[PDB]
Amino acid sequence: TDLGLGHNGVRISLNYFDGLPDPSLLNSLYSNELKLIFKSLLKRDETTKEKALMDLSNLISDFNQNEYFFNDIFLLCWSQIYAKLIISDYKVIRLQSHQITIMLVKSLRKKISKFLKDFIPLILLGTCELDYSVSKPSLNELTECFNKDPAKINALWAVFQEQLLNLVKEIVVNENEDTISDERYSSKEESEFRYHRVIASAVLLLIKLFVHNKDVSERNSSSLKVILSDESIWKLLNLKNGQNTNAYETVLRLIDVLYTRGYMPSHKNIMKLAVKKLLKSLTHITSKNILKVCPVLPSILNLLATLDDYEDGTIWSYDKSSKEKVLKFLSVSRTSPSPGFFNAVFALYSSTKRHSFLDYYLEWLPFWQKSVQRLNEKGFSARNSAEVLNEFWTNFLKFAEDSSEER
Ligand SMILES: [K+]
């Protein structure tokens, strides 16, 4: 049987309809107080959950009196609902749930070693939550749980890399908008936003896994292929609305790491999947939303310059109208340039000229011309006027020195 995130006989999942504590297992709990606490956590009413978690948290803080209660039956049950609690919209529920688990690890050391495979990956997922109101306190209490040693934390990323990837796979491949949220009690927007948060956390977790493990690609090739071949991660490459750009930038970073490590060159199918979605997202940038998106444009351009190095600009062939997309993307983005922008544009020019992607005089030159025109009319009133203006001229002069052979 597929136990999902579970490694001790019971199924642990993030969805709402399975991986639930068996009614018999619950009745076998030590104290009648626990039975009610758990029955309270299996409901939907989130008000009574905050108290139930508070009560449970109190029983664990007073570990002296209460200890025989926190046995294997408790850990099996808790490990199942813990997974479902950390996807709640109420950040208090997610935070308290993490603290409880962290407290259990810190208190039942050795006695809980068997369950660490189930708890650590979810704790770390909490530290990867883009909301710092949850990810910072979680990481703090976690770091404190291990003698305040950040090296002991970095070890966790290596020890549990298999279970960490399995968690990613569960979020990305197996669950979706309609399994993380019950359509009967949740609107479409609610479901989307909820799933977005969870998968966004998974992408960051996935990135941290490459940071801490130099051989992750080779040691987990089959697991990574399943994760990255799915469409779900790459669907995050969306700048339309309503989400901010945090998740978007995180995927950019993932693509970069994957390319740098030489993973994507090894998996053309996955690279085609990511790039197609990346190129399509360029069309999401308009005058309507340029002011919300402009701080991530240097990242886009730099990534495209990097990818252009693959097989002499082969990535551009993944989209029949990639040239047109880039042109329209450049014309929009020059209206609201930010620091690093012109450095990135030149990076793209310097790389793509090797196969004459865009015309020097009919396409590149007017871009630079209209750019300085924009900078002169508005600035230098705006902030970072001097920095950006100087950045433009430094890069244009380098661009202009190629006008030699292009004549
Ligand atoms: K999915």
How many whole angstroms separate alpha carbon 154 and alpha carbon 203? 18
Report in angstroms the alpha-carbon separations of 341 from 224, 345, 381: 32, 6, 19
How many whole angstroms separate alpha carbon 361 and alpha carbon 171? 48
Q: Which amino acid is at 285?
A: I
* Cα 160 to ligand 1 centroid, rounded to whole Å: 23
Q: Please name the residues in contact with 61: beta carbons below 8 A apart, sequence gap of 6 or more.
A: 103
Q: Which amino acid is at 160?
A: F
Cβ proximity of 395 and 345 under 8 Å: yes
How many whole angstroms separate alpha carbon 381 and alpha carbon 402? 32
How many whole angstroms separate alpha carbon 86 and alpha carbon 374? 47
Q: What is the DSSP letter of 364?
A: I
Picking from 200, 207, 208, 108, the residue whose alpha carbon sits closest to that of residue 153 is 208
* Cα 208 to ligand 1 centroid, rounded to whole Å: 20
* Cα 37 to ligand 1 centroid, rounded to whole Å: 31
* Cα 80 to ligand 1 centroid, rounded to whole Å: 20
Structural Rg of the chain based on CA atoms: 25
Picking from 100, 58, 51, 50, the residue whose alpha carbon sits closest to that of residue 78 is 100
How many whole angstroms separate alpha carbon 193 and alpha carbon 199? 10
Strand partners, 12: 4
* Cα 203 to ligand 1 centroid, rounded to whole Å: 12
Report in angstroms the alpha-carbon separations of 16 from 75, 99, 175, 244: 19, 22, 10, 27
* Cα 271 to ligand 1 centroid, rounded to whole Å: 18
Cβ proximity of 357 and 313 under 8 Å: yes
* Cα 154 to ligand 1 centroid, rounded to whole Å: 28
* Cα 165 to ligand 1 centroid, rounded to whole Å: 15
Strand partners, 4: 12
SS3 12: strand
* Cα 233 to ligand 1 centroid, rounded to whole Å: 8
Q: What are phi and psi of 12, to 5 degrees?
A: -115, 125
* Cα 227 to ligand 1 centroid, rounded to whole Å: 10
Q: Which amino acid is at 179?
A: T
Report in angstroms the alpha-carbon separations of 401 from 187, 304, 360, 407: 57, 23, 11, 11
DSSP string, 216-270: HHHHTHHHHHHHHHSSTTGGG---SSSS-SHHHHHHHHHHHHHHHTTHHHH-HHH
The coordinates were experimentally obtained by X-ray
Neighbours of 248 (CB within 10 A): 20
SS3 207: helix
How many whole angstroms separate alpha carbon 223 and alpha carbon 168? 10
HSE, CB side, 13 Å, CA atoms: give it for residue 12: 26
Neighbours of 7 (CB within 10 A): 16
Matching residue, tokens 């935070």: 95
Query: Is 137 exposed, middle or buried (CB count within 10 Å of its CB: 0-12, 13-18, 19+)?
Result: middle
How many whole angstroms separate alpha carbon 60 and alpha carbon 112? 14
* Cα 247 to ligand 1 centroid, rounded to whole Å: 15
* Cα 169 to ligand 1 centroid, rounded to whole Å: 9
DSSP string, 103-157: HHHHHSTTTTGGGHHHHHHHHHHHHT-S-HHHHHHHHHHHHHHTTT-HHHHHHHH
SS3 73: helix
Picking from 83, 93, 95, the residue whose alpha carbon sits closest to that of residue 45 is 93
* Cα 87 to ligand 1 centroid, rounded to whole Å: 15
Matching residue, tokens 């704790």: 123
SS3 185: coil
How many whole angstroms separate alpha carbon 150 and alpha carbon 142? 9
